[PDB]
């Protein structure tokens, strides 16, 4: 990915579940760059397990940004759980500490956009996203 999206991400909403304060910090220095503009960006805490409370009442956004502190077993548990609350449209991303392939495997064969390890630049979130909508 070498694409600088001089054009912007399209208009888009997304709703990051941060776990980690440096993520929360990541994600709020990508939403506040000029080509992420038009995407409006909402950055909550409680990781993916509040994702999976905040999804059973309200309709979930363009993009789901998702990360947990409690491991992989525990991360795809709750991936099945947010799954059922997740409408059509809708794209997740997981933000994890571990560089891992069985994780990253499994991850993309339950429909993961993308995962995103840690530590990142706010450059490597913006061309994550762009990506998704090229």
């Known amino acids: 990915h070498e694409n600088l999206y001089f054009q912007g991400i399209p208009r888009i909403?997304?709703?990051?579940?941060?776990?980690?304060?440096?993520?929360a910090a990541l994600i709020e220095?990508?939403?506040?760059?000029?080509?992420?503009?038009?995407?409006?960006?909402?950055?909550?805490?409680?990781?993916?397990?509040?994702?999976?409370?905040?999804?059973?009442?309200?309709?979930?956004?363009?993009?789901?940004?998702?990360?947990?502190?409690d491991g992989a077993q525990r991360l795809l548990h709750l991936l099945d759980s947010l799954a059922q609350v997740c409408d059509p449209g809708t794209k997740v991303v997981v933000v994890g500490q571990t560089n891992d392939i069985a994780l990253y495997r499994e991850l993309m064969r339950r429909g993961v956009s993308e995962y995103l390890t840690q530590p990142l630049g706010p450059l490597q979130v913006i061309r994550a996203v762009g990506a998704l909508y090229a």
Do not use: W
């Open 13 to 23: 909403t997304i709703h990051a579940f941060c776990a980690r304060p440096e993520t």
């Open 29 to 69: 220095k990508a939403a506040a760059d000029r080509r992420m503009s038009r995407a409006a960006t909402i950055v909550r805490d409680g990781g993916l397990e509040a994702a999976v409370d905040y999804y059973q009442n309200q309709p979930t956004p363009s993009l789901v940004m998702v990360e947990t502190l």
